[PDB]
Design an enzyme around this catalytic site. Structure first.
Site, short mmCIF file in Angstrom:
data_model
loop_
_atom_site.label_atom_id
_atom_site.label_comp_id
_atom_site.label_asym_id
_atom_site.label_seq_id
_atom_site.Cartn_x
_atom_site.Cartn_y
_atom_site.Cartn_z
N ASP A 44 -2.99 1.99 -4.11
CA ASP A 44 -4.19 1.45 -3.50
C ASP A 44 -4.58 0.16 -4.20
OD1 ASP A 44 -6.59 2.17 -1.59
OD2 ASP A 44 -7.44 1.39 -3.47
N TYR A 49 -8.58 -7.32 -6.40
CA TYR A 49 -8.15 -6.80 -7.70
C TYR A 49 -7.41 -7.84 -8.54
CZ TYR A 49 -9.58 -2.41 -5.57
OH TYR A 49 -10.29 -1.43 -4.92
N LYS A 78 -6.52 -4.78 0.74
CA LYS A 78 -7.80 -5.01 1.38
C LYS A 78 -8.18 -6.48 1.57
CE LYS A 78 -9.21 -0.79 -1.10
NZ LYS A 78 -8.41 -0.92 -2.36
N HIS A 111 -12.21 -4.74 3.32
CA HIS A 111 -12.74 -4.24 2.07
C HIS A 111 -14.22 -3.90 2.16
CE1 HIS A 111 -11.96 -4.50 -2.56
NE2 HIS A 111 -12.76 -3.50 -2.26
N1 LIG Z 1 -12.49 -0.09 -1.62
C1 LIG Z 1 -13.38 -0.03 -2.58
O1 LIG Z 1 -14.50 -0.50 -2.47
C2 LIG Z 1 -13.05 0.66 -3.89
C3 LIG Z 1 -14.05 0.75 -4.95
C4 LIG Z 1 -13.69 1.41 -6.16
C5 LIG Z 1 -12.39 1.97 -6.34
N2 LIG Z 1 -11.46 1.83 -5.26
C6 LIG Z 1 -10.07 2.36 -5.45
O2 LIG Z 1 -10.03 3.77 -5.85
C7 LIG Z 1 -9.49 3.89 -7.19
C8 LIG Z 1 -10.14 4.94 -8.06
O3 LIG Z 1 -11.51 4.61 -8.31
P1 LIG Z 1 -11.92 4.07 -9.72
O4 LIG Z 1 -11.02 2.97 -10.05
O5 LIG Z 1 -13.37 3.73 -9.75
O6 LIG Z 1 -11.66 5.28 -10.76
P2 LIG Z 1 -11.69 6.89 -10.75
O7 LIG Z 1 -12.97 7.30 -10.37
O8 LIG Z 1 -10.39 7.33 -10.13
O9 LIG Z 1 -11.49 7.18 -12.32
C9 LIG Z 1 -12.35 6.51 -13.22
C10 LIG Z 1 -11.93 6.71 -14.71
O10 LIG Z 1 -11.91 8.11 -15.24
C11 LIG Z 1 -10.83 8.28 -16.14
N3 LIG Z 1 -9.97 9.33 -15.63
C12 LIG Z 1 -9.04 9.33 -14.63
N4 LIG Z 1 -8.37 10.46 -14.52
C13 LIG Z 1 -8.92 11.24 -15.51
C14 LIG Z 1 -8.60 12.56 -15.88
N5 LIG Z 1 -7.67 13.35 -15.32
N6 LIG Z 1 -9.33 13.11 -16.94
C15 LIG Z 1 -10.33 12.37 -17.60
N7 LIG Z 1 -10.65 11.06 -17.26
C16 LIG Z 1 -9.91 10.55 -16.20
C17 LIG Z 1 -10.20 6.89 -16.38
O11 LIG Z 1 -10.68 6.36 -17.61
C18 LIG Z 1 -10.59 6.06 -15.19
O12 LIG Z 1 -10.70 4.67 -15.46
C19 LIG Z 1 -9.39 2.40 -7.70
O13 LIG Z 1 -8.36 2.15 -8.67
C20 LIG Z 1 -9.25 1.61 -6.42
O14 LIG Z 1 -7.92 1.50 -5.96
C21 LIG Z 1 -11.79 1.19 -4.05
#
Ligand SMILES: NC(=O)c1ccc[n+]([C@@H]2O[C@H](COP(=O)([O-])OP(=O)(O)OC[C@H]3O[C@@H](n4cnc5c(N)ncnc54)[C@H](O)[C@@H]3O)[C@@H](O)[C@H]2O)c1
Ligand SMILES: NC(=O)c1ccc[n+]([C@@H]2O[C@H](COP(=O)([O-])OP(=O)(O)OC[C@H]3O[C@@H](n4cnc5c(N)ncnc54)[C@H](O)[C@@H]3O)[C@@H](O)[C@H]2O)c1
Lengths: 319, 319
Positions: A44, A49, A78, A111
């Site tokens: 994704d 990014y 996006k 996006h």
């Molecule tokens: N389209 C949009 O507006 C939008 C916005 C935000 C994120 N996204 C997408 O979705 C993805 C995921 O969202 P995100 O990036 O906010 O993060 P997330 O919510 O998936 O995870 C956030 C954080 O928690 C920790 N984490 C992950 N797995 C863990 C585990 N098993 N145990 C403990 N801690 C853990 C890591 O430090 C990580 O940085 C992004 O990389 C992106 O591709 C899209």
């Protein structure tokens, strides 16, 4: 092992992906390669990014080693806000294709339902919040449908396989559906126990639109960005309701949080930034939550939103 | 005196009006005639109210007796959900004009961002939730902007002075602003202490859109409809916060609830069903609430919505 979801467009999209937001440029390629070795196939990403070239390096490296073929990798990207005007949509998509080093992206989404004033790619890329006038925000009059039709043309041209939208509230998605020839195959929104939006999810799934949840771990992701709101919020990893359910099935709170979505047919794309997490985040479909479980978690819903355009410049997307 | 609000269309609009919803057909004429006698000039009506013919009788009589001229009356109407498809817009507006017995309406609003399947006037009028297939709901793929443009043409034809929308959430309003040539002069939404949507109000007002509030008395109007949600909600008239503020200024809770909106530049259109309420509902601008008052009332905001399409057929307008 990783279940696929059949999109309304006919193509399959893996239900468990790899998040690329805030994925460091210097290690992006290596991390993508490792993820592919670990089994991930959906990546994704996004123009905003700023790491598509690298994500591309990772995928290409895997392809060159013979680990996977292009058709086995699902690439999501996006369209950033400065490129909603139809005349600039293909331009942006081309930059994306060139950076990822592929002929097509599998999923391309609007996006945000926001149209920043166009900024030429040679002046600043990715632009982020830049709108061609210092720090000021500037917008252009481009209805979503115009951008959407531009995207439909690109699907026929073969540059995109499936198109969808991100950060769209119910009313906006309903209206878009009225003018769409190709129905948005995906709706990608912030989804976690604190922001459940059960009605939005119900409407979209019933309309045949696949939901992809982002920031499944709630505040965590924004804590890492030093966001005040997230910092003041009790983590979902240490929440009593979540720990209890986790203990009950002898699983980790993180596993419950992902299962909670997956079991309801929602795709996840967690940010796995540690070898251990790479494994953890794709091996949680080993237990089933009961109705009682869902009711207990449903209680955490307080409509707490961490990714909010209102924070940027009072854009009324979620008001 | 009822201060006026200069709309973005350039026309003035009375900041206080006479609600015409649920105004019975048998007495609608007399009631409007009396409201006119008591000073009211704006009359918030709607094709869906099924009493536009009577509202007209009232105004016509007022004009015939020389109490007022057409110029002095502000008539608001609303395009119902079955008439969104462009070709049905002018026919619907005309039926409203013949009914009100006037040449133009001062304000015409898209009643809901919902497009019901067209139902001929002669088959049923007003159609309400009738969609031409028994009790089933059937919709039309007509984007908002198509309907909006249909309205703009009618403004050019001199059949409408100003146009606007009702029940539009933030995202949807923002998207229309991108396609509109004539900006929506008004946004009419449910607005009371239990559903303040401050951000929506702030954005709208900064975009130059005027806010018209409805159901200023919360669950009250819907309590007179035997609606579960409304009946199981503490009336604003008894609520401790309102009661106290009203006592403090020796005003009724109704005066406090109306001033709460007016003071913030929001237009009000209370439904005055009694001779005394008629007067009171237009004489509450005799005091100002303080910062502390607003702070205390602000705490009542729990986003409790009484007029929600979600209840009709799970229409995602507010999700
Ligand atoms: N389209 C949009 O507006 C939008 C916005 C935000 C994120 N996204 C997408 O979705 C993805 C995921 O969202 P995100 O990036 O906010 O993060 P997330 O919510 O998936 O995870 C956030 C954080 O928690 C920790 N984490 C992950 N797995 C863990 C585990 N098993 N145990 C403990 N801690 C853990 C890591 O430090 C990580 O940085 C992004 O990389 C992106 O591709 C899209
Ligand atoms: N566009 C829309 O979707 C929409 C929806 C609902 C109403 N409206 C309009 O806005 C108006 C206001 O809405 P409403 O009629 O539902 O509710 P309201 O808030 O005007 O009043 C509701 C009820 O409270 C009582 N009331 C009125 N004045 C009072 C007073 N001074 N003291 C004590 N009780 C009093 C009456 O019995 C009345 O039925 C309507 O008349 C209608 O024209 C528009």
């Amino acid at each position: 092992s990783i279940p696929d979801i059949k999109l309304s467009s006919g193509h399959l999209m893996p239900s468990i992906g790899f998040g690329c937001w805030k994925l460091a440029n210097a290690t992006a390629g290596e991390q993508v390669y490792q993820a592919i070795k670990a089994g991930y196939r959906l990546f994704d990403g996004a123009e905003d990014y700023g790491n598509e070239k690298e994500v591309g390096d990772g995928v290409k490296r895997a392809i060159d080693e013979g680990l996977v073929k292009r058709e086995e990798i699902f690439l999501t990207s996006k369209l950033w806000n400065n490129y909603h005007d139809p005349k600039n949509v293909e331009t942006a998509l081309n930059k994306t294709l060139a950076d990822l080093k592929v002929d097509y992206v599998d999923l391309f989404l609007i996006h945000f339902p926001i149209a920043f004033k166009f900024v030429p790619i040679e002046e600043k890329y990715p632009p982020g919040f830049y709108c061609g006038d210092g720090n000021n925000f500037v917008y252009e009059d481009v209805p979503i449908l115009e951008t959407w039709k531009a995207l439909e043309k690109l699907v026929a041209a073969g540059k995109i396989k499936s198109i969808g939208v991100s950060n769209f509230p119910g009313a906006l998605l309903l209206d878009l559906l009225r003018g769409a020839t190709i129905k948005p195959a995906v709706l990608q929104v912030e989804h976690h126990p604190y922001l459940q939006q059960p009605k939005l999810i119900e409407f979209a799934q019933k309309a045949g639109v696949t939901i992809t949840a982002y920031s499944s771990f709630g505040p965590q992701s924004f804590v890492e960005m030093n966001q005040g709101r997230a910092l003041n919020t009790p983590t979902l990893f240490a929440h009593d309701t979540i720990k209890a359910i986790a203990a009950k099935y002898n699983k980790t709170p993180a596993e419950v949080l992902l299962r909670w979505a997956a079991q309801r047919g929602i795709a996840v794309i967690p940010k796995s930034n540690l070898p251990e997490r790479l494994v953890q985040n794709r091996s949680f479909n080993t237990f089933d939550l009961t109705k009682e479980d869902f009711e207990e978690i449903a209680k955490l819903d307080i409509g707490l939103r961490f990714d909010d355009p209102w924070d940027w410049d009072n854009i009324p997307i979620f008001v």
